[PDB]
Amino acid sequence: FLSLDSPTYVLYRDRAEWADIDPVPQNDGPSPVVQIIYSEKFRDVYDYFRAVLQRDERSERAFKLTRDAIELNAANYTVWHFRRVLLRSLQKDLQEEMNYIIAIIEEQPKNYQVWHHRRVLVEWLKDPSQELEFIADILNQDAKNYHAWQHRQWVIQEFRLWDNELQYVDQLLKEDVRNNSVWNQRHFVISNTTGYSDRAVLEREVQYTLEMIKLVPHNESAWNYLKGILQDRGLSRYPNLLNQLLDLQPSHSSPYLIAFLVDIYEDMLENQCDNKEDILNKALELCEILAKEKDTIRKEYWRYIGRSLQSKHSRESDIPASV
Amino acid sequence: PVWSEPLYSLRPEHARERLQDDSVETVTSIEQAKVEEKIQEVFSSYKFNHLVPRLVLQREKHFHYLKRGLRQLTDAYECLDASRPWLCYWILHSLELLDEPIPQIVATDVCQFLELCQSPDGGFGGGPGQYPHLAPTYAAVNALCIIGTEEAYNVINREKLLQYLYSLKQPDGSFLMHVGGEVDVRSAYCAASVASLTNIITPDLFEGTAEWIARCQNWEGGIGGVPGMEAHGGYTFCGLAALVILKKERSLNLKSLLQWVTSRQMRFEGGFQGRCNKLVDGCYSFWQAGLLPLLHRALHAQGDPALSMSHWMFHQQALQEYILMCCQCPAGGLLDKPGKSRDFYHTCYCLSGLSIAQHFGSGAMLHDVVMGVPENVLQPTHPVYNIGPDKVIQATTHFLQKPVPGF
Amino acid sequence: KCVIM
Numbered sequence: 261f262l263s264l265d266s267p268t269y270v271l272y273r274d275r276a277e278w279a280d281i282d283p284v285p286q287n288d289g290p291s292p293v294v295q296i297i298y299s300e301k302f303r304d305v306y307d308y309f310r311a312v313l314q315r316d317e318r319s320e321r322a323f324k325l326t327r328d329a330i331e332l333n334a335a336n337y338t339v340w341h342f343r344r345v346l347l348r349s350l351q352k353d354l355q356e357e358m359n360y361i362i363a364i365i366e367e368q369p370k371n372y373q374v375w376h377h378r379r380v381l382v383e384w385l386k387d388p389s390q391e392l393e394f395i396a397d398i399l400n401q402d403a404k405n406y407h408a409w410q411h412r413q414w415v416i417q418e419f420r421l422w423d424n425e426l427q428y429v430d431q432l433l434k435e436d437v438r439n440n441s442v443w444n445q446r447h448f449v450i451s452n453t454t455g456y457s458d459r460a461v462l463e464r465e466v467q468y469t470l471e472m473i474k475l476v477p478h479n480e481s482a483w484n485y486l487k488g489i490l491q492d493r494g495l496s497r498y499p500n501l502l503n504q505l506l507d508l509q510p511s512h513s514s515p516y517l518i519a520f521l522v523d524i525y526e527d528m529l530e531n532q533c534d535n536k537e538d539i540l541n542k543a544l545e546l547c548e549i550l551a552k553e554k555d556t557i558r559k560e561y562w563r564y565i566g567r568s569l570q571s572k573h574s575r576e577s578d579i580p581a582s583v
Numbered sequence: 584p585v586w587s588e589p590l591y592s593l594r595p596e597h598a599r600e601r602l603q604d605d606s607v608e609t610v611t612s613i614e615q616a617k618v619e620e621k622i623q624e625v626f627s628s629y630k631f632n633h634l635v636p637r638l639v640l641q642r643e644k645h646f647h648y649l650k651r652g653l654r655q656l657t658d659a660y661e662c663l664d665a666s667r668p669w670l671c672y673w674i675l676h677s678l679e680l681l682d683e684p685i686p687q688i689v690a691t692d693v694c695q696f697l698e699l700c701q702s703p704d705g706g707f708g709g710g711p712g713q714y715p716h717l718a719p720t721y722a723a724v725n726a727l728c729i730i731g732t733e734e735a736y737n738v739i740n741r742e743k744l745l746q747y748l749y750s751l752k753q754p755d756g757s758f759l760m761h762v763g764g765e766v767d768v769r770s771a772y773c774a775a776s777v778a779s780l781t782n783i784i785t786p787d788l789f790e791g792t793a794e795w796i797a798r799c800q801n802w803e804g805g806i807g808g809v810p811g812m813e814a815h816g817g818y819t820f821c822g823l824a825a826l827v828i829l830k831k832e833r834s835l836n837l838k839s840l841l842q843w844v845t846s847r848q849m850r851f852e853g854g855f856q857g858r859c860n861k862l863v864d865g866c867y868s869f870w871q872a873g874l875l876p877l878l879h880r881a882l883h884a885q886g887d888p889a890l891s892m893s894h895w896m897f898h899q900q901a902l903q904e905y906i907l908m909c910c911q912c913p914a915g916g917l918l919d920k921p922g923k924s925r926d927f928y929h930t931c932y933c934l935s936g937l938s939i940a941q942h943f944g945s946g947a948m949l950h951d952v953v954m955g956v957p958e959n960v961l962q963p964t965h966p967v968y969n970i971g972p973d974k975v976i977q978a979t980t981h982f983l984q985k986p987v988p989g990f
Numbered sequence: 991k992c993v994i995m
């Protein structure tokens with residue numbers, strides 16, 4: 261009906277069809293703190309909302325009023341709750357409500373209430389058919405929208421819509437290989453489908469990641485993913501990894517490559533590798549290069565790593581005090 | 584020496600910390616480059632102007648901004664009409680950090696206002712007449728504790744608060760944010776924070792909560808909002824802090840957590856980003872850097888012998904430089920980054936992060952690093968609650984006198 | 991702006 265931005269929008273206190281209701285002003289107390297000087301429109305809609313809420317009026321007019329209260333402040337969770345009460349009591353068409361929430365989310369995509377409301381609608385309707393495409397549209401405007409990715413994981417998991425997600429992930433990684441949200445989604449899909457234990461899958465993944473690293477040596481996400489998928493089984497469990505990383509040292513170095521080498525040495529030392537000492541020194545040398553030259557912002561972390569590796573892997577580490 | 588630059592961000596070598604896009608341009612790198620260029624301008628400003636840099640925390644300006652905001656706000660805050668207890672908390676905490684006393688006229692009015700926000704069934708809402716929600720409940724309790732008077736403490740209806748927490752608890756260990764609301768790690772933290780402070784933790788209230796939080800830690804090392812989601816500073820802080828309160832930090836792989844948070848500090852800007860490959864933002868000076876004191880306390884409890892006895896595991900100096908040089912609004916208030924407008928949320932978290940960066944404390948060991956003028960030093964903040972350590976102790980002690988509801 | 995609730 262009458263949009264909040266309509267040139268001919270009229271305050272509720274000037275609407276004949278609302279003459280029977282006494283608006284309920286906000287109870288801020290005798291001497292308010294953090295008192296917001298609301299605009300006329302805001303205070304008017306909310307004084308009427310307080311009235312309908314207070315008398316629990318489950319009417320069509322109350323329903324339309326919540327649309328205005330939401331447009332004035334979409335973060336008002338109390339209004340959203342009352343709106344859901346009205347949707348049920350008045351038996352409102354939920355697909356019409358879906359059309360409404362998709363418009364609101366398009367407008368205010370980084371809001372908690374709007375995404376939760378959409379979830380409730382999907383649950384009520386037991387229909388996820390518009391989800392992936394809707395979300396894809398939001399992700400097309402902000403490829404890192406946290407609420408969008410979170411809702412997407414929920415839909416996919418609850419309705420088992422795994423079939424095309426990896427293809428979607430590949431598409432977004434093409435658009436921006438630096439999108440950490442997509443790398444997280446990639447891990448999400450694989451973990452809940454094939455898993456990473458399947459050797460053919462794990463290899464495909466590491467191959468892909470090393471390939472992305474070669475193309476963009478300084479993209480921290482690829483590095484984190486590579487480490488993320490191998491760290492659990494143990495970095496030392498993969499002897500060829502080290503050799504291969506060292507092969508990128510010249511034409512593809514970065515503090516990320518150096519940091520990874522330390523991660524490999526650290527695990528090797530943790531699993532009694534050969535040449536305990538030769539490895540430890542290579543590690544402390546890299547830690548120093550990082551703390552003092554290649555990654556000084558993390559000097560405190562690197563000095564700590566160097567100090568930990570020293571503390572438990574030096575030839576003196578297992579040697580009693582008396583010796 | 585004389586040619587030596589004491590400010591880390593202005594050193595000649597610092598230019599080496601600029602982004603290397605490998606000639607592969609993507610939205611991420613383009614956006615990152617824009618921020619770095621803007622930040623570089625701030626850094627080089629003293630040099631182009633031929634002035635010696637002086638890092639001054641504009642206290643008087645920040646005080647005026649807060650002092651007024653605690654009383655009245657413009658319609659710019661309509662979007663926060665359901666977060667009034669947060670406005671109370673953010674402001675009172677910023678004032679507390681700045682060591683500005685809270686007049687008893689003010690204290691009593693805040694108490695009365697928060698009472699109006701308290702629900703008949705427990706918890707606090709975003710404003711009078713609004714349904715209770717865990718976020719404004721966390722903020723309200725923190726604000727009342729910052730005040731710390733008998734009157735303030737007495738506002739909290741502990742029995743109904745406990746009932747409220749139970750009504751939100753889920754079978755999987757998580758909590759809803761409010762009735763009919765969403766679930767994410769914020770709820771676990773908000774619940775543990777208020778329940779621990781008020782001494783209402785029953786034996787089963789947090790049953791399975793630590794496990795649920797542990798499921799949020801992902802392949803990155805950090806913690807996401809819910810299991811499966813990308814590692815995020817705000818949620819990571821909520822997860823770790825909640826686990827520290829529950830005394831279950833060990834459920835996490837603290838090693839990967841530590842490596843992840845430390846990697847979130849930006850090499851060029853000096854401040855922290857919320858997620859890998861995203862932009863720097865002053866509020867993360869708290870959510871991210873605040874994890875270091877938590878990790879230090881946890882690792883130390885495990886007898887970690889390599890832990891420093893004078894510094895947190897982050898570049899304290901660079902964080903302070905970022906905040907002081909890039910996050911202050913000239914008119915008062917702090918912000919996200921240059922080009923963004925001030926707000927009380929960023930004012931609260933930039934200052935909180937600054938305090939964390941200035942003060943190292945681990946038992947008897949104490950070491951401060953105050954960049955710029957010595958007047959820049961703020962009051963310390965508790966890394967779990969983000970209110971003065973003294974307020975935490977005072978509040979807990981007071982509530983330990985009462986018995987846990989029901990007994 | 992950053993929204994936390």
Ligand SMILES: *C/C=C(\C)CC/C=C(\C)CCC=C(C)C
Nearest residue numbers: 718769817818821866992993994
């Ligand atoms: C731009 C900064 C944002 C969106 C902040 C993200 C932080 C959180 C989410 C953490 C919220 C914590 C509580 C509500 C206790």
Ligand SMILES: [Zn+2]
Nearest residue numbers: 864866919992
């Ligand atoms: Zn922010």
